[PDB]
Amino acid sequence: MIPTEEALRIVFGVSKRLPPVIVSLYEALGKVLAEDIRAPDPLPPYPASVKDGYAVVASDGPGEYPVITESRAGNDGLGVTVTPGTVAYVTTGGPIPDGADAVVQVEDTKVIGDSKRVKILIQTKKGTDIRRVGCDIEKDATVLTTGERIGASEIGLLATAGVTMVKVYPMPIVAILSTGDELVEPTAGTLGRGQIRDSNRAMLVAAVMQQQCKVVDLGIVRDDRKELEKVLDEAVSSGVDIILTSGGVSMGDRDFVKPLLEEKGKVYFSKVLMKPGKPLTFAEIRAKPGKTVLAFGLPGNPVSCLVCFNIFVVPTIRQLAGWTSPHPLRVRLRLQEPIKSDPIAPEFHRAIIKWKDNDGSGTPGFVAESTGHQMSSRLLSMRSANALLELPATGNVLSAGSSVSAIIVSDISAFSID
Amino acid sequence: MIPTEEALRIVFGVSKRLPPVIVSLYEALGKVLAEDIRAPDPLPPYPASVKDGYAVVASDGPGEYPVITESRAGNDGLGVTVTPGTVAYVTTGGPIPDGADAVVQVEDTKVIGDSKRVKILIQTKKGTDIRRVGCDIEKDATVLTTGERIGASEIGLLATAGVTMVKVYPMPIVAILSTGDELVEPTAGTLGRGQIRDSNRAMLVAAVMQQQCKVVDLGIVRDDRKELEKVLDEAVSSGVDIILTSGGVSMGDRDFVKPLLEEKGKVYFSKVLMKPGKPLTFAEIRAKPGKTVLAFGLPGNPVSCLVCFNIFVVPTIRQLAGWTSPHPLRVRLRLQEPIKSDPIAPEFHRAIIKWKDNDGSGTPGFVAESTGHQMSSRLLSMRSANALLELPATGNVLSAGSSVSAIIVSDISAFSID
Numbered sequence A, B: 001m002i003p004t005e006e007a008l009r010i011v012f013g014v015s016k017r018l019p020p021v022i023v024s025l026y027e028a029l030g031k032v033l034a035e036d037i038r039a040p041d042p043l044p045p046y047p048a049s050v051k052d053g054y055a056v057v058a059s060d061g062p063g064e065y066p067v068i069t070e071s072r073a074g075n076d077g078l079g080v081t082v083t084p085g086t087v088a089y090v091t092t093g094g095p096i097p098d099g100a101d102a103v104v105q106v107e108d109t110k111v112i113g114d115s116k117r118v119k120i121l122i123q124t125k126k127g128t129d130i131r132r133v134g135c136d137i138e139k140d141a142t143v144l145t146t147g148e149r150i151g152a153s154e155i156g157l158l159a160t161a162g163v164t165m166v167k168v169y170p171m172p173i174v175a176i177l178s179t180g181d182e183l184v185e186p187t188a189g190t191l192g193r194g195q196i197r198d199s200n201r202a203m204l205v206a207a208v209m210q211q212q213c214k215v216v217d218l219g220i221v222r223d224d225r226k227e228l229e230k231v232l233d234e235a236v237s238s239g240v241d242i243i244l245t246s247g248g249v250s251m252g253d254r255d256f257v258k259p260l261l262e263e264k265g266k267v268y269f270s271k272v273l274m275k276p277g278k279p280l281t282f283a284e285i286r287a288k289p290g291k292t293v294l295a296f297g298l299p300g301n302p303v304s305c306l307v308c309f310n311i312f313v314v315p316t317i318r319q320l321a322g323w324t325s326p327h328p329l330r331v332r333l334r335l336q337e338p339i340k341s342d343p344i345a346p347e348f349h350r351a352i353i354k355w356k357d358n359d360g361s362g363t364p365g366f367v368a369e370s371t372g373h374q375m376s377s378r379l380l381s382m383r384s385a386n387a388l389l390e391l392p393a394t395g396n397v398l399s400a401g402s403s404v405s406a407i408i409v410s411d412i413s414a415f416s417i418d
């Protein structure tokens, strides 16, 4: 039995970033860049107006002037020189004609006569409301770097730089199976004696889908050593990067996941000091030429299964996908109610957290409510839980208002407000 | 010109939740439930062992007993009665045979002889390590309610309850187009005079994809009133729920988005007191029978375009998708450097935030670094920005260490740690 901190260090040290691939612009969204991106031309590539108005010679000052050209885009005003005593109409983003050195916004002008004459109402300064060439992005500047995750603004920067095929780290492909003679499919209606619906598989498929990985659903496997070996061998040779099993890892006489992973590869650990999730097994299998496949023998209890996924599998998926910061967000928060910690193992207590203007202490902060009974068979304890409170193994009652560390397990930008 | 708080109230009051649909179990992930879900049978539906060990009559106490059956799943031990002086082998999740009232874990037992006899080493108590029928979920209990967002544990609860077709609120379908005679596709190589690559469209497509909505990409539209009217009429009749345009909303003589939205429907506002994002237009159009279509005339400047999407379009998508809490997460944080606020409009200053063990004041908390120059044409100011600092319109220099409100715009569970 090892502490969670050691089990995580072992998984981190074994897990390796996947080889990079080339994907299309929209396939790059959510992925980590595997190359730097440099601007092939400046932004703007021409001196551009910041305003709708008139391009002027700043030293002319207020007065009435003829409008000698109009510039909105492309070749508008090409070959025209704005000289002292003239002006040109411009729209925001329009190229500034040669000779003009400032822009006066349309609100500081007045059209005169029934042609093309305008009264400039202010004294402007050279460079006003003009974006010089390369103002926003210089030619050859690095706009994105290796190791940077691609979000909507990074997609915008790739499109600005004319990059439509991108080198990125791919997401791992994950195989998932359930084990047990007591399981039936979730489509089952009336249950026979000693049967339950398989809930872990669909839960894990959804959890892997939220991590943006492809899923290989290998179904229900019975408590038969030869049958489980065949499905594991088929998963290892299929090209997946991670295999997730659940169940078949306790102390029963038909629990074959641990001995099969010891036979096929290297089991680094099979027991972790934590509440819930004690029988977690982690192994590295080499596929026959070749490549490595990581295997997590997740506990069968629905709570322990999801908690082990959230703590151990999520950072592994991220490390394989090239994240330089794969750890989950940990924050400090105040308890809204008393919680008894466990005397033996540190507990990952499920909670519903929210940011409050007053966290109970007079300053704003996160607060947590327990999801109720924490029994590992009670999947209702995971319902709505956006965090796991890290309770040390003291056995004491942590009073309401005391502070604890919490791992945030669901989209902090999708948090329901107080 | 109206404040952002009013513009948001107007959008909220006009935006209506979409009609619910029936989807498959994995299509339900990320969606909001439009019906309550009740358990059709208890969990466990039979008295189940918590441990691998032996089912006993608690009052027998320590001693040597014959093993009369073995129970792991289904019909194992059906018709067998564990009487005083006997025991049954059980695995975790196995049905407890009739007559047995407690389980002694295998670590508190010893197999005796070369058949089927075991020594119970402890005095157990009635009910120990047994999950009674309905312990985790009672028959007919409500396990999920209308208005609840479906995550991995909620998928697990639907599978537990045997629900594979779910009534949910769908995501809106969003049409997106860019406007401008100066734009070229992002595939363009060498740019001609007065041209830039269209960056807003791919940025917005990515931003809508991150919100899990279907995208209708309507391409680049030129600064021609008849051409833009045709594309808007085609978008309105196509069945989309939201139309996003960018550009063509400033003070130029070829900016037709505002007058076209006034002609086609009801424009509620066209100017907002904010930095950046002043020319934001919002309208409601009725499609010819029928249904309503929401239109956002987003500003052309790349920064203003994305900031307006993050503040106004994200909560609208969420409201249409049935979220009861569509507002973004707002937190309080300390500045890592001084920032000058604007004297006229409240600014949405882009920042990179992280949670620190010491936020500078001695207590843990969020801290923020500015992304640098905030000019609305500088898309590099959005790069890596996971928050918008809400700076009031005071014109003062907010010193390093002072506290501000911040809107979190990117997955708080994907935050890079300190």
Ligand SMILES: Nc1ncnc2c1ncn2[C@@H]1O[C@H](COP(=O)(O)O)[C@@H](O)[C@H]1O
Binding pocket: A048, A091, A092, A093, A094, B178, B179, B180, B182, B183, B196, B197, B198, B199, B200, B201, B246, B247, B248, B249, B250, B252, B299, B300, B301, B302
């Ligand atoms: N799709 C786009 N991508 C990048 N920049 C744009 C886009 N549309 C408009 N702009 C720029 O945003 C500014 C305002 O545009 P507009 O409101 O059309 O005058 C101008 O500098 C445009 O060149």
Ligand SMILES: Nc1ncnc2c1ncn2[C@@H]1O[C@H](COP(=O)(O)O)[C@@H](O)[C@H]1O
Binding pocket: A178, A179, A180, A182, A183, A196, A197, A198, A199, A200, A201, A246, A247, A248, A249, A250, A252, A299, A300, A301, A302, B048, B091, B092, B093, B094
């Ligand atoms: N796929 C599954 N869905 C729901 N419960 C499960 C699943 N697999 C195992 N269990 C339960 O988890 C507990 C531990 O399983 P095991 O480790 O196989 O003994 C038992 O109560 C099982 O019935």
Ligand SMILES: [Mg+2]
Binding pocket: A179, A180, A181, A247, A248, A300, B093
């Ligand atoms: Mg089992």
Ligand SMILES: [Mg+2]
Binding pocket: A093, B179, B180, B181, B247, B248, B300
């Ligand atoms: Mg334009």
